[PDB]
Amino acid sequence: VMDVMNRLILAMDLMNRDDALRVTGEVREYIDTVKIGYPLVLSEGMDIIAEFRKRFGCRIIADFKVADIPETNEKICRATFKAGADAIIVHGFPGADSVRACLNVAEEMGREVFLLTEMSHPGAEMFIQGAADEIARMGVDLGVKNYVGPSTRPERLSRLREIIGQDSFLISPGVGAQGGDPGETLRFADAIIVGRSIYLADNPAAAAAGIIESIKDLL
Amino acid sequence: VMDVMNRLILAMDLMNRDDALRVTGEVREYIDTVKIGYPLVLSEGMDIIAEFRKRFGCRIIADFKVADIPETNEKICRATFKAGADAIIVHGFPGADSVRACLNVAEEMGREVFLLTEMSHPGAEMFIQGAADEIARMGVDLGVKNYVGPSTRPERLSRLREIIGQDSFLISPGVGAQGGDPGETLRFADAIIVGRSIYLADNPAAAAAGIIESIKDLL
Numbered sequence A, B: 001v002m003d004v005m006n007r008l009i010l011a012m013d014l015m016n017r018d019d020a021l022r023v024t025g026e027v028r029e030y031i032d033t034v035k036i037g038y039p040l041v042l043s044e045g046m047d048i049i050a051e052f053r054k055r056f057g058c059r060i061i062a063d064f065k066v067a068d069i070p071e072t073n074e075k076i077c078r079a080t081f082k083a084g085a086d087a088i089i090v091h092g093f094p095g096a097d098s099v100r101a102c103l104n105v106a107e108e109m110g111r112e113v114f115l116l117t118e119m120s121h122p123g124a125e126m127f128i129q130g131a132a133d134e135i136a137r138m139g140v141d142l143g144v145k146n147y148v149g150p151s152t153r154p155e156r157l158s159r160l161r162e163i164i165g166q167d168s169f170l171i172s173p174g175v176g177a178q179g180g181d182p183g184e185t186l187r188f189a190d191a192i193i194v195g196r197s198i199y200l201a202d203n204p205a206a207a208a209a210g211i212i213e214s215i216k217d218l219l
């Protein structure tokens, strides 16, 4: 499994290259894993991934929530891994063939697929939540070993862990800004994803240090 | 609603700038609306939208299938409209708050949201299909005016048309490569989306001219 320093993944969703690099540099002593998404990539280009690798060496998870047909999913994954991402996050809701397409490219390029099963925001309750256990089972059937579930609903996160087993790797967003607690989330997830609580902080380094301090006994 | 020339939208999913530009230029006399997605954008940058605008008299629909939490959706939409997209495609399955976020940005920035309700690929049957009527009804209640539904399932496309009413705008992918028929799809959809059937042809202009000839009585 992926070895995430301090069990803490930075969600770098600032949309200015100067700010994103500066803030990431400010917290670099605390993390070795950065989650980069569309806010940054669509503002500054996919070349930003190589820039992070050059400046920080961190591993890069592309949170692209891939959710297209199989043929197009393959193209998206290929473009993403070509840009230097170590892993990609894929939606499970569009079905098995769409996930398999991503697994195919990941296998070909030696990278990892993370399956997003239940999302962390309130609207996740409308359609995703009722499908989520089945989506996780589908992941297991497909041989998926990396998963994403919601910090905002620890009971749902726990169920996700139950389904996938202790051997699978599980990361969890919704910590801080969305209301999730770092320590409680780490009862079930291998690592927490944290964005705004760090990158909007007046002092991001102190923010990251504070989070890590709060979970010291879990490290 | 947008006035799509020949009821035909080009899905430009080539991943090389030179190829994408060549093919789009070759079919420009038949099409004034181009759908750009992540295969091209992640390969060549969001600057490709401006370049298409510069080279062609074409409106741009960004098929980004936005599927994040509300706050991140806002950022994605902002980045996409800043780059010059006329419209963005958003997934409905993450729920009402996620869709509303996109609508709010679209209203502020004077652009349009298209709601993707049911997808065209076989895997869409697993989770999306069972939610699709309610996703559509949600769209209607949110005041969504533009929709995307599957050419590959005429019965489902027909039901979607019913739900959204005759005044709503409906575009439909899955024509050609995925098995959908141009004429039958236009019984319900205002415009068809066609990718590979055009852009992989020895003569894209002839392929587009051929599709249009086959629906001539519908124009």
Ligand SMILES: O=c1ccn([C@@H]2O[C@H](COP(=O)(O)O)[C@@H](O)[C@H]2O)c(=O)[nH]1
Binding pocket: A011, A013, A037, A063, A116, A118, A119, A120, A121, A148, A149, A150, A173, A174, A175, A176, A177, A178, A193, A194, A195, A196, A197, B068, B069, B072
């Ligand atoms: O169910 C999910 C899946 C992914 N994210 C992503 O995780 C990060 C959360 O950031 P923040 O809430 O800590 O700022 C954002 O990049 C967001 O897109 C979620 O918040 N919830």
Ligand SMILES: O=c1ccn([C@@H]2O[C@H](COP(=O)(O)O)[C@@H](O)[C@H]2O)c(=O)[nH]1
Binding pocket: A068, A069, A072, B011, B013, B037, B063, B116, B118, B119, B120, B121, B148, B149, B150, B173, B174, B175, B176, B177, B178, B193, B194, B195, B196, B197
């Ligand atoms: O349910 C959907 C929604 C969007 N698309 C998009 O429409 C285009 C279809 O291309 P093609 O099958 O005509 O090549 C691609 O960009 C694809 O991502 C679908 O195929 N199905």
